Design a protein around this ligand. Structure first.
Ligand SMILES: N[C@@H](CC(=O)O)C(=O)O
Ligand SMILES: N[C@@H](CC(=O)O)C(=O)O
Ligand SMILES: N[C@@H](CC(=O)O)C(=O)O
Ligand SMILES: N[C@@H](CC(=O)O)C(=O)O
Lengths: 325, 325, 325, 325
């Protein structure tokens, strides 16, 4: 009768433990085990039959592509089992959007995959982790949650991995998608589903990574007044396969950036022009080098580019991925 | 009886001219002269006695610190004159926030300095430039506008240079300060002032650049999964005096970024940890390298750092600037 | 080869004509004919074969349910024709959300129905109507726009009738759905679809009004400190069939409001508890009188209640409508 | 050395106590005493010397003007004492904005007055009250907090009573001022002040209520399609002295509402046209009846109108209050 949910722990402030109730820096993110998290919210056991698995225990600023690859592989294994109805992944907030979007493109199942995180450590006064986890378990176990793509659940909100981003350095309500909104919200112990994303993901995605053991190198370069050509030269010299440009406005580029991007393209590096602004569409512009990010922000664009480079070097195909995923 | 306003033109989509009413890319930003702008909104002449001056005519993605320095010097000259009551600066949207914040720190006058820009070119259907300019002139000529710091006026809103940022690649309403709001709004031909910024600026600022002819080099490095050490090495090798880090979450840093920042500090480079998120406070953390950006986003933080480096290398002094400016 | 679009005009500031370019009040909304609108944006004729029809010419604050009923009936007639591919409805901004939501529930077609409006009159400097109309025609004629429910298009954004609301009295960017986002955006002459609404509408809706000639009376009462019982007594005395309560917080009710709501229910009036806050979920609460609005704001809740009352008085059925529509 | 702070308790979900950790409705708001609140966050005693006083213990939907009057009188008494450095007022979230704005206009002291509330009850998993109270005490005890007007503190944010409103029925981040932002934020145990409000308040306000024992009656009427004249007739018949109209768009009014407003003005009732939209400016319009609310939302506008009516019936004076307070 209860759903079977695996809580797969990777680390984060959600598993952080500090010396006092108001310590906000200098505590170890990813100190507490997945069973400690579970045991602090015994209410979870009335929503699902939960099993904890300790995948890693790191702060998400140290999450790396090779590890995210393994996480995606393990989640694909789990969801292929009949005794697993969904998976909740505990993660740090800083790079959750990157990890979640990676799994959104690579998990070949319609069963729910819900990332959860906490802006305050577990020891903190008014810690948000307990309720965030409870909400994430509720979402992962609900039959209505299937086929929605990978989700990110904090602060009563259910965000699509493709749209959601950490918008604020430090607040509980940081995760928002200003232009695209939330997939749903959790209020009064009930899920209210609002939207389905109109993009390819999960079971309809071409991005299979089950045979892979590493990913193509992609760096992100910022756009600003006086931005230097030499950062493009260094990226090329170090063997990047892609550069994502966090551009000025709508992916616009200085004379120096144009020179860098042209040098990159000459050396077989794919350039995606995204925006530093935080939101909105980078439109095509045939007068400029590179491809355009559609509404993907720089961190998301890097994840799609990395995966696109496992399949193709055809700029028409990559550009179409950015308009469809 | 009318205020005397100088319209000082630098370029931008506000002075853009395209082949049709819906062409959104591949037109020259900064094609039209300041007198063409003025002549399209003759209504401006009922609000002020206006004089146009063509300072530059470039797209703002190509605006550089050396030029912004000269702009600040020229605006300081103008505002010292009794026949100038305020100045409106037409600029591209992409880097307006950078130029405006520079002048906010360096213009030693309480007379209004209002940057204005347009998201659609002058030729576009429903072009926003005409009304934005009219509003900017109204603001610059109003006696109530004095002593407010440098302002950015688009879409009926008056933003402080210290808070306002381009939040969306492509929309008319892009300029917002999500946490700090607008200084005021212009509705029905009337200015409604809401807030005064609680920060140092203009006449209370230490940042004098009247004797300067160049600025210290500062680059911006992004924070993301797998971010590389080699970009810090390249920046150091190329003689940066500062690095602003657009960090993961609240200026958090990977093992690789920490190694880079430590190398930079060892070579006499000041590091400021800002955030890629778009909003909010990077708090102090003595366990991490560098100084923290307070609520300055990466583009603003670069401008303050550059100016701070003209005066000092004392990290206590620079850190205090970031909490006060 | 071009789509066939009917532009059905009802009035609004989009068809407003004032004496000068900055007159913001005291002009007649709905002065200009639909052919004048069309002739100001001849670009529309490259996107569709357009035909204008003058349905009404009023300011939307004077739009009434009886007229909205007829509008829905006429749109159902039009969309049943093979020579009509979609319909764009020009309307005032003040009550567009009400009219649009009514049609969202009652138009039995998957062909696009796009409401469009303008915050500045047609004569205004930087009038937004021309571009809003062009965007609305583009949306209505696109094959990808089918089956999305009724849409509201201003300022480069495509809002669902069920979520979108006028959030600001006076700004061009007023239409937003803070929690649910936009269905899509129009940038660079291209439509970017983001979301499909996860609610019943149009072809899946039970709300048929083709045989009807009037609608049940529903009033809206506000919630605030010292709110009076006597307004409930007056509404009952005047024969309301429903009351929507724009409640304090999450539909919460004073001792006086509870007395009023109980009196209403005793006299056969259905009460829906909504919120004055502007956003979010009113959860069920069996300790309080009436039904709950889910995330419907007061204006939308009134439209659903009115339609629900044409079909049923069963509070279980009405409550389920509020969770599904 | 520590500041002396009085915690003056009125009730609310902050003092709510439910049977389980996830019960969201049907619990008594204002069950717990002020000493229970204090004893749950002993950390408060390291920030201030605190004394609790139980002013009332009600749910804020039942807060009434007569009681808010007494609260303002008591806070004025407290702040006149040398042994009180500031006051924190615990209150329900639903009408906090009304009570806080009343005190903003009537407390004749520059010492901090900080309202605090909680969206989750004290018993709830991840209850927000403890941290909100700690933050409110920090704000009230800080010397930099003086002369800022009355503040509302939840979720790491410090809102001005004049701008802040509950924007969402049910979320922790509900309190926002979309156009005006926050006065400050509290992150990492530190206050970051961003703005000072550019409006009259507290020590510069004319609104003295120290001799008063009751307030003029003011009701709020909503604006919508088919809005009825009879609600104006009932309000007049019941002796209102003011009506605030939560208007369609920018305070716009139907033919029926105009008839009602004219009848009200004929009987000596002052009408203020506000907006139901949630934000922005209602501009003057001499073609319409009544005065305009500037950017005051309906709940705030009622509080100012009530106080304005204790002093004057001169519409020029009242209109100027709405532009200055
Ligand atoms: N640095 C932490 C921040 C958080 O979890 O809130 C992490 O991302 O692991
Ligand atoms: N690239 C243009 C964009 C704009 O002005 O909207 C500029 O910044 O010059
Ligand atoms: N009162 C006008 C406002 C607008 O269209 O902007 C209307 O709703 O008809
Ligand atoms: N109804 C409660 C809601 C809250 O405090 O959150 C109150 O306002 O008293």
């Amino acid at each position: 009768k209860l759903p079977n949910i695996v809580i797969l722990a990777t680390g984060g402030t959600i598993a952080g433990s500090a010396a006092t109730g108001t310590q906000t820096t200098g505590y170890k993110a990813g100190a507490l085990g997945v069973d400690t998290l579970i045991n602090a919210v015994p209410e979870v056991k009335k929503l699902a039959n939960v099993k904890g698995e300790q995948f890693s225990n790191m702060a998400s600023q140290n999450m790396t592509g090779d590890v995210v690859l393994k996480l995606s592989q393990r989640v694909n294994e789990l969801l292929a089992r009949d005794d697993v109805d969904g998976v909740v992944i505990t993660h740090g907030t800083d790079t959750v959007e990157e990890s979640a979007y990676f799994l959104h493109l690579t998990v070949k199942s319609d069963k729910p995959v819900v990332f959860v995180a906490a802006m305050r450590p577990a020891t903190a006064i008014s810690a948000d982790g307990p309720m965030n986890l409870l909400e994430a378990v509720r979402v992962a176990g609900d039959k209505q949650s299937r086929g929605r793509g990978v989700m990110v659940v904090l602060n009563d909100r259910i965000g699509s991995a493709r749209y959601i981003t950490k918008t604020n350095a430090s607040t509980l309500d940081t995760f928002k998608a200003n232009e695209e909104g939330y997939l749903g919200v959790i209020i009064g112990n009930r899920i209210y589903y609002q939207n389905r994303i109109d993009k390819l993901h999960t079971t309809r995605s071409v991005f299979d990574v089950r045979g892979l053991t590493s990913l193509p190198k992609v760096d992100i370069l910022y756009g600003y007044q006086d931005d230097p050509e030499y950062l493009y030269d260094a990226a090329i010299q170090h063997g990047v396969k892609g550069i994502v440009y966090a551009g000025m406005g709508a992916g616009n580029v200085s004379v120096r950036g144009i020179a860098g991007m042209r040098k990159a393209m000459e050396k077989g590096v794919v350039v995606i022009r995204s925006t530093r602004t935080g939101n909105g569409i980078v439109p095509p512009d045939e007068e400029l080098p590179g491809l355009v990010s559609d509404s993907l922000n720089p961190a998301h664009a890097r994840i799609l580019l990395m995966l696109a480079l496992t399949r193709t070097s055809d700029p028409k195909v990559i550009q179409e991925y950015f308009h469809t995923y």
